[PDB]
């Protein structure tokens with residue numbers, strides 16, 4: 001047989017049917033499910049086996065989360081640990097792994113559909129365009145929410161001319177365009193996708209100079225900003 | 237009818253989305269981009285489905301085959317490796333389908349850099365270390381890169397790099413990055429993530445020793461460090 005394992009699973013961008021097959025099958029097979037708040041679609045939780053311990057981690061500290069996993073480990077019970085999107089980017093999986101290694105609790109990771117992919121799909125767009133863009137930068141702004149390492153400034157990324165997929169930043173929409181106009185041009189295409197794949201999904205396309213900045217301060221913060229020529233060109 | 241562009245995922249049959257599998261099961265016609273789309277997914281095609289490998293085909297022939305399905309009112313499952321947003325050549329197909337008024341939609345998939353990070357058990361962004369991931373490639377005698385998109389310019393940011401389509405020029409990648417990232421900078425290469433013959437190498441830029449081409453290069457401190465903050 002196999003021993004108790006914590007299965008980190010990328011739940012995808014919000015639609016229950018955008019989890020992987022593997023992701024859903026692991027949910028179906030774990031007696032304990034820990035899900036990272038309402039950004040994990042509740043319909044996924046219907047896959048938990050009958051009698052599962054289902055735990056919303058959004059009100060919990062990292063310590064409480066780790067203690068709960070340690071309890072599952074002590075009981076020999078597999079855990080389905082669900083995070084929105086994919087695990088590789090801004091998931092806070094890393095800090096959990098470090099704690100699990102220190103406790104010798106085994107884990108594995110099942111990749112998900114990241115939100116920039118959901119957003120591109122919503123737009124019906126290939127981001128890479130021969131002769132226009134051959135790179136995509138996944139980034140964020142400090143946005144009064146983080147320190148960025150020194151070299152990770154919008155200015156330094158903007159200098160490459162790559163497609164930018166800017167996360168965690170819709171509340172600072174106005175600063176973003178101010179910092180990007182000098183590099184990309186006033187007329188550079190920009191697209192914002194709120195809540196990609198949710199019943200709630202909303203899109204705005206414009207150029208940097210013509211984007212309605214006040215859209216950012218609105219209630220919904222789950223939005224991805226895409227910037228670059230390849231968002232609105234057929235010249236490729 | 238509708239042409240369903242679908243991100244097949246990194247290769248394992250179970251790393252397609254539920255939606256993607258369901259769309260495949262409901263399409264009388266399936267167009268798949270080569271053996272980089274695992275054959276097990278083709279088992280999901282409905283009985284008597286016309287299944288077509290597009291790898292041997294020109295864009296004109298692909299669009300013809302689609303226009304045929306459209307004239308026959310038959311939905312098309314159009315499979316590409318990984319996700320569609322990056323180096324899929326989905327774009328040129330949509331440009332042609334628009335010019336013909338053929339309806340399409342896009343189902344996102346798991347990109348290979350995500351599958352690679354997952355096999356490594358790694359979160360790429362780590363507070364106080366790296367808050368950005370650059371998905372890129374090299375010219376590598378296979379492309380022209382826009383002028384701003386050099387390894388040099390990217391390396392200047394100190395971001396994590398997920399370098400695609402570049403394993404044939406690993407030597408030159410290493411030499412360009414060392415000056416910026418350091419000789420001791422952790423690096424990992426994942427060949428064929430999620431496939432049965434998946435191979436993983438973890439090293440540093442200096443100690444990585446320079447033939448499958450389906451490989452992803454990942455570079456950065458966050459690949460092997462526990463000195464980071466909570467979020």
Ligand SMILES: Nc1ncnc2c1ncn2[C@@H]1O[C@H](CSCC[C@H](N)C(=O)O)[C@@H](O)[C@H]1O
Pocket residue numbers: 013014084085086087088089090091113114115116118119166167168169193194195196197198221222223224225
């Ligand atoms: N369904 C969705 N639609 C649009 N943007 C989304 C989204 N889900 C997450 N995001 C973006 O991701 C940020 C949260 S950080 C978590 C990102 C997630 N791990 C991923 O793989 O994408 C949000 O601020 C927003 O910029």
Ligand SMILES: Nc1ncnc2c1ncn2[C@@H]1O[C@H](CSCC[C@H](N)C(=O)O)[C@@H](O)[C@H]1O
Pocket residue numbers: 246247317318319320321322323324346347348349351352399400401402426427428429430431449450451452453
């Ligand atoms: N299973 C896999 N393992 C490692 N790298 C892979 C892979 N599948 C694709 N790649 C990478 O992607 C390149 C092909 S370009 C297609 C990328 C795909 N659309 C995606 O979403 O990732 C290859 O050169 C390789 O770098």
